[PDB]
Design a protein around this ligand. Sequence first.
Ligand SMILES: *[C@@H]1O[C@H](CO)[C@@H](O)[C@H](O)[C@H]1NC(C)=O
Lengths: 50, 111
Amino acid sequence: GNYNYLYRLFRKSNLKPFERDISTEIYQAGSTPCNGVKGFNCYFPLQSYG
Amino acid sequence: IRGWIFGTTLDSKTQSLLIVNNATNVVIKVCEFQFCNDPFLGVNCTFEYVSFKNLREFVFKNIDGYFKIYSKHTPINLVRGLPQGFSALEPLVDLPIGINITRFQTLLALH
Ligand SMILES: *[C@@H]1O[C@H](CO)[C@@H](O)[C@H](O)[C@H]1NC(C)=O
């Protein structure tokens, strides 16, 4: 697997036309905050094709 | 007045637009800047560019990832403040930067 190619699976709001966003801050997916640490309803926003 | 910051969170968690004017050149950057809590001048990155008898006017507008700048320089006589009468600004630049700009601040200089 080539893991060096990546895409964003999560964002709270969709991009406007040619809006660009590299920020990797952990996605809070529900009522529990991330505080920067992955877990229950707290997911890394990027993913890899492998 | 010698520059501007534009961005979202202004804290290195994003690309942020920095614009600076100095006597050698005018400079523009979009880097993931860690700004200080009190920006002035005592006399990752993905885009960079380079170039009271008077009033300088500008308009900054951001549309579909392009940051558009219009300007005018004019003599004035009404020394009190922002004057009446009329003259239209003209385009200088149209910058491909893609940033979700929502906050801004001016940059000052000290002797
Ligand atoms: C742009 O930034 C603001 C915060 O300043 C945020 O609420 C918004 O969701 C962001 N994205 C878009 C698509 O505007």
